């Protein structure tokens, strides 16, 4: 029997609308989420920490508090990037310990801990700290494919992770690289090598995730991730409902009420419309990962990169260079941060016409052991070209980090109201300073959500609308020439403006009939019914036959007309008894339900 | 003249300055960041203005100090004015013998009478009119 | 062993996702590649395309078949035919079925997938005999559904009969995505024991199970599988062709298919589809509600569009509740064309009318009088009465009561019809075909043109965005403005104004180079990938009657360049990037 | 008229008299108010 975790409140909107979902749009439906029998709900972690602060201007610690209060019966699950936590770099051990402590204290029950490179040295402190606080540690194999990855490689990592003291092991296929065949074997080979329940997390981008889940439950997987259908599929995960429906009746039947799920799905369907501005240019099944294993969404950021530079014509080159650089760096999994790293370096090499003539500073750090142990051995000529003879460190990179908790607290004395505020700082100090500052002043201003129909008006008249004016008043005329945007964040967007060749920045903040339903006539010219003897259709279509002439005596129920509507014929019959006075319709005519097609005088 | 609240360990008091009347007449110089309506951003320091008082001698100055501090009228944000008035009151200061320890050596200076805001009196009156009319 | 794959892009794909509106012009450019993949067959013609080509595209569907046949020489073309119903919504006389199949075969078709809504196999026999007669491939179709009356043996019994009629293959048509993977394994097993024929799975994806359903099928010996190219795949459509191919590479079932060629074709279709933005529907994704309203994928983007045209999309939730209730009323027929239009339209009427069976389509009446065939379960007597009164339910194969009408039809269209095909076009929809044939011969056809995704919006729509009052911050001051020659209120002071008209990423990094003042670029002194130290002349700009050189804030590597000579810049724009 | 208004930890004894202006006594301290 299979347990199910839903990812809507984190990976779902992270994958499909750039992590922009407000907490306000999450709470109304929480009591229902709590009522389903979910194994856990993925509520916090990953990119949400960043996004809450950077864009929503909300304290992520608050979101966790509220979600914890509104989902009492359900166990909350977070995604943590080991020593990297929810941030950009490795953090000192005392901060990892403090973070896990605060996450636990404030609600988290399950901690999914993974490391991009799979360098398990990076997870240990987290896992010990999670175990220490008496919470659930789910150690994560972050799946990829390369000459070095094979099933034993992964089961070896699963064994170590059991040895560190994990409650469950998680397979995280971030880029949808599992084939169903591999997923059967892998889960088998893991069930023999480890005594722990297994958690499958298979993004759907390639189309195989649902087949992959099938093979997994066949071979004894215990827990499966899905997303509620309104946010499911494509860059997200398989639809929670679809999983439930595919196991009803089987020995694996999840005890789950698919109609309750559907209600919640509908709720989210509505919410999502608000966020139209963050929808991805590329929706659905992005098979490209399946020609040559470059994650879809890696190619959409790469192209976004090349467009801005005027250089899209080089993408075919860059995608040939990508796997060569990945190979040069020892087949690391291509996830953040490694994917940016590889991709940008590849772009450089192409533009330069020379491999590693120019080298990203983050690539250098990669080659200096700073991110961890590359799963395969790095190219020595590349390292030397990039980094020379320099110290490839070979220890666990936090080993080089002095305890920083005391240091940070002092740095934020007189802002941070609490330990949580100090840990927020730790994740992104520059950004957190401004945030803490704006919060304590009651001055936070989230980016407002745009209305879809309004933005589309202003952008269509954007190449058309005039700029150069002559403005006359009080005798004087002034030559004015505007520049720059006012349709993409216009309360935020400032013009630049030239008064008689003197340009000054301006900022604007906005403060905000002849149509007749009343008329006797419909659009066509045909009269709307005046009274109840006026015969009408209840759905538009084309007239097949008029069964009556300008003067006839008719009794209620008599076939008066026929229409084809929705490709089906319907004989309109007389509402009232009496005399046919007029007929305003001919065979062939297209008609609508507010038009009066004949008139009949009662009695 | 920093926008802080000395009662609350000099915590910043960022926000909007609703009313401001500048000090004036003899012996008075103002060097202001702020003005009427100004909204103090929270990213920088708390200093809304420097108030600089002058007189022909020690006794006179102090008196003029006291005056100019009151003379500076600032609604919307808690300021250090009240605190300064405590300093100018205190005899060791008037006596003109003091060193860096003076503030530390006299914590009492923050325990002062906080005159009740005219912005609250107006509400109390308005409530008397509300209860009297319906 | 090896599994063969049929692609449905050119028919079911756009029928399921953009209301059957795909033009033939958008099909031909990519035909030589479709031909090059090893597809078992391509589904090119049939279903709703006949209707749609005439009604909306104003093209002759016989022409589409001719062109597609010529552009896909090596591939075998496949059509979907609704038995006696052909490519319409009612039964046709036997002489017209025979004539149609003859013409379809003559003009290209190789495989005929033949199914009947009711599963009343009496309705398929003329078609199948006629396909066999012309020496072409007859694929007899079980149209899958679920109800208290249906089960695996019921279907295998229908498969056996269909073998006995002389079919080359048997097809499982899950129009509404009702198969669960468990059932699909058992069913294909039970079919492989009961029949000697290869089996063809056609599983729409609406419920999310189709891909799991296919896996179980191939495990239990299914021979041919339908997919749709990825740009039109999933949801109301079928599973992605590529995804199938990838999930069988390496296995004993490996289809020999070049997933990169497929991707190229998918990309082509991705572009095409954008033209058709106006027919996309909110209701084409994964929806497990389908397991009960049972509306088929091929139906829903058409139904949705149909409600849109009437201003009644807000009523869909109602219609889908009403659908299963009307289906029960009519004895749990499988919801396929034409039963699905019938039930669906009736359901729509009922909702709009505010009353059940107050109005009753003629085709519902015929349904209730036994004219589509035998309802698998018993019909509601009160509904029959309300609709059809005391009248009598026939119990024979309804075409038995239909006089041969081919010669009758040719005469009716003498002086319009340029050809025998024009006569069969008439036969499908005489009223409509008459106007078409007329308009065509007069060179006077006017297809609904496709809308421009951003047409310039009218002067009257622009004004609801434009502001009346607002706050202008100019040189430290802000000013409250309210406009109404304009008349204009600056801080409550209204002054007449007169106007005469005259006819890039923001910096995330501190390394992102910016101007602090807008102007035009004179020269970029750097190429991508350069190593630069702080203080190096990186750019030159013209501003304030002068040219002057911007220099590097930070040391390191030039990563991008978002500017060329000639460009106008503003200070919020990031003009290059540099990595420290 | 003889009100006691408790606003924000404090109470205040108010006594009114009378676009036209009241005269108003806050804890026995009278002064002119104008309402519009
Ligand atoms: C008008 O011609 C649009 C197509 C008609 C409705 C389509 S036909 C095939 C689908 N099945 C069904 O019952 N309705 C859909
Ligand atoms: Mn994920
Ligand atoms: Mn179909």
Numbering used by the authors:
A (entry chain C): 3 to 514, 527 to 617
B (entry chain B): 338 to 471
C (entry chain D): 2 to 485, 496 to 514, 540 to 616
D (entry chain E): 469 to 486, 494 to 511
Please give the exact wording used by the authors of the publication that reports this structure.
PC is a member of the biotin-dependent carboxylase family and contains biotin carboxylase (BC), carboxyltransferase (CT) and biotin carboxyl carrier protein (BCCP) components. On the other hand, in a diverse array of Gram-negative bacteria among the phyla Proteobacteria and Aquificae, the PC enzyme is encoded by two separate genes, with the BC domain residing in a 52 kD α subunit and the CT and BCCP domains in a 67 kD β subunit.
To improve the diffraction quality, we introduced three single-site mutations (K419A, E421A and E422A) in the β subunit designed to reduce the surface entropy. We then removed the flexible B sub-domain (residues 131–201) of the BC domain and replaced it with a Gly–Ser–Ser–Gly linker. A mutant protein having this deletion and the three single-site changes produced a different crystal form with better diffraction, allowing us to determine the crystal structure of the MfPC holoenzyme at 3.0 Å resolution using the molecular replacement method with the SaPC structure as the search model. Contrary to the expectations of an α4β4 holoenzyme, the structure revealed a 370 kD α2β4 oligomer for the MfPC mutant, with one BC dimer and two CT dimers. The mutant holoenzyme has overall dimensions of 140 × 130 × 70 Å and adopts a shape similar to the letter U, strikingly different from the holoenzyme architecture of single-chain PCs. The BC dimer forms the bottom and a CT dimer is on each arm of the U shape, leaving a large cavity in the middle. Of the three BCCP domains that are observed in this mutant holoenzyme, two are situated between the BC and CT domains, near the bottom of the U-shaped structure. The third BCCP domain is located in the active site of the distal β subunit with good electron density (β2), and its biotin is well ordered, but it comes from a proximal β subunit (likely β1). Therefore, the BCCP domains are extensively swapped in the holoenzyme.
